[PDB]
Amino acid sequence: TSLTITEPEAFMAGVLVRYRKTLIEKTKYHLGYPFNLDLDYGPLAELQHFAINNLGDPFIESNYGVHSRQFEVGVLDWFARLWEIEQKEYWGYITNGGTEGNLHGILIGREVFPDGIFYTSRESHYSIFKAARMYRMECVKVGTLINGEIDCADFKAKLLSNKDKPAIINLNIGTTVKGAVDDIDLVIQTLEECGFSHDRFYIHCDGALFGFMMPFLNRGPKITFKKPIGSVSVSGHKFMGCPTPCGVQITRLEHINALSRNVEYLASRDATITGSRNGHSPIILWYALNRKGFKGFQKEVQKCLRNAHYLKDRLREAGISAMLNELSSTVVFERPLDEEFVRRWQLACEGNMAHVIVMPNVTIEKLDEFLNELVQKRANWYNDGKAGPPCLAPDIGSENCDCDLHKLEH
Amino acid sequence: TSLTITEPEAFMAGVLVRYRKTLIEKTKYHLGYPFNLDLDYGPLAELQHFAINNLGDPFIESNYGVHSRQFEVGVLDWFARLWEIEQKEYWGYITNGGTEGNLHGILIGREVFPDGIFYTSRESHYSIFKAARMYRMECVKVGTLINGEIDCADFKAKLLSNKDKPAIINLNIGTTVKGAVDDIDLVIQTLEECGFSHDRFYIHCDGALFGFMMPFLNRGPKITFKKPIGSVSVSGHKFMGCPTPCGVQITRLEHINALSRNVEYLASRDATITGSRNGHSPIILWYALNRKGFKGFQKEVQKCLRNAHYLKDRLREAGISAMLNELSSTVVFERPLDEEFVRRWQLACEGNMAHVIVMPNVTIEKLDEFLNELVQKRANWYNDGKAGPPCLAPDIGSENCDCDLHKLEH
Ligand SMILES: [Ca+2]
Ligand SMILES: [Ca+2]
Ligand SMILES: [Zn+2]
Ligand SMILES: [Zn+2]
């Protein structure tokens, strides 16, 4: 459905009204992807009048004056507080998304250790493997437990067979498909007891969704630069919500010296992946953090976990295979067989799993509308004498599978 | 000037009114950077209500439904027509800027030729060298004529000393500082006559500013995939104008197969540098191309060249060193000595050069306000018996220098 451009009104603002309609509709039924669709930023749309560009370092003002560094630096300072690094220990910037933050953090680690072996789990986001290939790093794929966590036994095994070289590591704070959280503490411990001291490994934390969310609980492996991590990224258009993709990458200031170069025509430094940078995003994220604070976010997070547990419980009671990890708003379940149902609710699918990500816009009323439809349609899919439901035990563990075999065991 | 975030109105919408004021002011006096500040996109700011995300390939719809691919594909088709490649010969996407397009095009070339030597001029944008380092390519810096063009003699010399390996080449369609245009035709010719056939070289065209502008003249070395180029990038927030940085990268479809990988949870492919992608940009660029067409752009371009020639002429008549290349809106001139004057007009500086880029928002009335101030202040800078003006002959040629020595020669 492409929309051809013709040489020279009505036809154009006609299109905006129709498109706006299809977006309202798509927004109503969206469940599959970790994007917060509850956007409360109406006062800021004045600013679409200016060409805001934070071109260069956030902490060194370029000669391009139409920028939002006041906001950007505010937001970054908040993130530094959130992850416990002090003003004079940290560098970072507001990115174009979680994949830019991954490319930045992995690049930083390659520069700390050019001979470094790179390690990540099999359930790392495609951005991580893209980065290693772009960067010509040796990528060792570490195995994974049933639930998605990195397997620190297989990790240990792999560390010891490359004991000469330093270790560069990506950890998944909330894997894309299953919503697992790599055990930072155990990973650190495993390194130390294979004779990797702090000065022979670099850890990047990919927290595109859950990295934002986890500091608002009193639970789980804390993300803090008091541990020997190297950098942490988050996507701003995931939990916080932002009309355009953005994110936040924060690293140790010591680490940024190897990337940072003066660029005379900016009167700034280039330590970012990008050149020109979105300067609306920093304002949008500043507005949100201010309106809501750590209390407003903690609420939204706790309600999202509650609503995911609800969804999971309702699915199990309908005898549909489903899992929800401890620290997660990602409900993995039996992949709907009706692919037009998949497209209507915009579900992400891998193999025999689909998932719903319960973002602030995802309400109980909306989960019920969905469970209604899914249950009605499921009845026509696996009726005798057709094959009967797929077994998700290999994906989510047999405790969570409700196929013909595993429903009996519970 | 950072802006601290505090836990919970007036204080916030107070800030927006003050910030909006400083942006109006900064927009009034901006001359140094290639950003079109004449933004006519008021009807589209409704859409800041949606989380538009073109996540994945522009031509394969992902399951995330809140996207602008209708627009994106329209815009890309227009660019394909503009650079003369047919619907079934080309792939491309709307990027986050000219640096993403550079990283994409250089990556494509590295995959066509993994053993390839990379060549660019000394006056390539910092993005180009950043890419080669990120990508661990061998970068051979080719020398440059006075005016900024790549020196195809020094090119030839360098080609022949690496005659075994294939050649990957970046060409600067409008260099950042001086506004030069690498001679594509001559570069091609030089390759052919050093025994590089089409299947042993890849050319990327960096056209962040002037790549958009040049097809609207009947002059200069035409950008066309009928010649053996590999890819062309442009920045959308440069000439066309866009509140957020964006761009357009177009390559040959044959070339994209080496990067493109299916990602099951998108139900799309990943052939981009990025993951999540701005889906407002494609709409903004679609609106602009439609309102104005090839006629509206041709006008804006011709007026920008006219206004640059004006600025240059006025500068020479005040006996201020200045150059304007043939195919350029970039007026290079004696770097103001008053750095607060530099910051007031937001000029980009390198060495003894500054420059004004004459973008559609840059009017004659505004150029005159600037020439007035510059001329008044210049009188206090080089009065006897202080040193007298710097010599820009090494930078811009002695025909364009008006120092104490070279002003005599003309
Ligand atoms: Ca329960
Ligand atoms: Ca003239
Ligand atoms: Zn089973
Ligand atoms: Zn001179």
Author numbering:
A (entry chain A), B (entry chain A): 62 to 69, 80 to 481
What text comes from the article?
Ethylamine (EA), the precursor of theanine biosynthesis, is synthesized from alanine decarboxylation by alanine decarboxylase (AlaDC) in tea plants. In this study, we solved the X-ray crystal structures of AlaDC from Camellia sinensis (CsAlaDC) and SerDC from Arabidopsis thaliana (AtSerDC). CsAlaDC and AtSerDC are Group II PLP-dependent amino acid decarboxylases, which exhibit numerous structural features common to other amino acid decarboxylases. The overall structure of CsAlaDC or AtSerDC is homodimeric with two subunits exhibiting an asymmetrical arrangement.
Through optimization of crystallization conditions, we successfully determined the crystal structures of CsAlaDC, CsAlaDC-EA, and AtSerDC at resolutions of 2.50 Å, 2.60 Å, and 2.85 Å, respectively. The crystal structures of the CsAlaDC-EA complex and AtSerDC were obtained and further analyzed. In the former complex, PLP bound to Lys309 via a Schiff base linkage (internal aldimine form), and the pyridine moiety of PLP is positioned between the imidazole ring of His196 and the methyl group of Ala279 in a parallel orientation to the imidazole ring. The carboxylic group of Asp277 stabilizes the N1 of PLP by a salt bridge interaction, providing the latter with the strong electrophilicity necessary to stabilize carbon ion intermediates during enzymatic catalysis. The O3 forms hydrogen bonds with Thr247 and Lys309. Additionally, His308, Gly169, Thr170, Lys309, and Ser347*(‘*’ denotes the amino acids on adjacent subunits) establish a hydrogen bonding network with the phosphate group of PLP, consequently fortifying its attachment to the protein. Upon superimposing the active site residues of CsAlaDC apo and CsAlaDC-EA complex, it was observed that the hydroxyl group of Tyr336* in the CsAlaDC-EA complex exhibits a substantial 60 degree deviation along the Cα-Cβ bond. After the transaldimation of the internal aldimine within CsAlaDC, resulting in the release of the active-site residue Lys309, the pyridoxal-5-phosphate (PLP) amino acid external aldimine undergoes decarboxylation, leading to the removal of the α-carboxyl group as CO2. This process generates a quinonoid intermediate that is stabilized by the delocalization of paired electrons. The carbanion at Cα is subsequently protonated by the acidic p-hydroxyl group of Tyr336* located on the large loop, facilitated by its neighboring residue His196, which is situated on the small loop.
